């Protein structure tokens, strides 16, 4: 059992002068992303989009344009610094969707509450020939 931490607005954002690498209309009408982390101090870190920003001591909130930017920055926060991070997807309705770490456990560490998806129980060479799924909507790897 794991309860995703809710996104807390009014969480401070890093010190940064602005860049052309930030959000666009996509964030207004489609979706954007938010990564939060806890920092032990004020540090300089490389922004996945602009140049250099100053991570604030304590909780940090950072809105990014793509999920991959959140995961890249988080990978670095966990690597260069030793910082726990989470990030979420945010729709223009205000709805928030917690994304990562999905279990509260990082996905490279096996966690027992996890259900198999897209797992085929056979060697890859035992997939059927296309002719055997022709005119059916299926793909030989969907089995």
């Amino acid at each position: 059992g794991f309860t995703p931490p809710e996104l807390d607005p009014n969480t401070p954002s890093p010190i940064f002068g602005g860049s052309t690498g930030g959000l666009l209309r996509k964030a207004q009408v489609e979706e954007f992303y938010v990564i939060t982390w806890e920092s032990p101090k004020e540090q300089i870190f490389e922004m996945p989009t602009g140049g250099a920003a100053i991570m604030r001591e304590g909780p940090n909130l950072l809105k990014l344009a793509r999920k991959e930017q959140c995961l890249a920055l988080g990978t670095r926060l966990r690597s260069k610094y030793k910082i726990k991070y989470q990030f979420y997807r945010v729709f223009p309705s205000g709805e928030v969707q917690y994304l990562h770490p999905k279990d509260g456990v990082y996905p490279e560490k096996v966690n027992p509450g996890r259900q198999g998806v897209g797992v085929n129980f056979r060697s890859i060479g035992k997939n059927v020939s296309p002719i055997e799924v022709k005119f059916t909507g299926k793909q030989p790897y969907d089995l």
Partner: protein, 80 residues
Amino acid sequence: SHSVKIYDTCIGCTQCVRACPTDVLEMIPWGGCKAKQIASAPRTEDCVGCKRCESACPTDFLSVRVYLWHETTRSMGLAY
């Protein structure tokens, strides 16, 4: 979205998950190898199709497969 599949030749070395830049893959429990874990692709709607996981697999042949499929804003890696 791109399809991503795991095959029971998987030995549970976790390298596909470590390589994935959008967090598509997880390690789930399993009894078929010594590491007692097998990969899984529960979030392929975020899959961008870069095949870093496939570059990371040590199994011959691969135990992750990325079948590039219907394109979306997320699969095309668009920030706009």
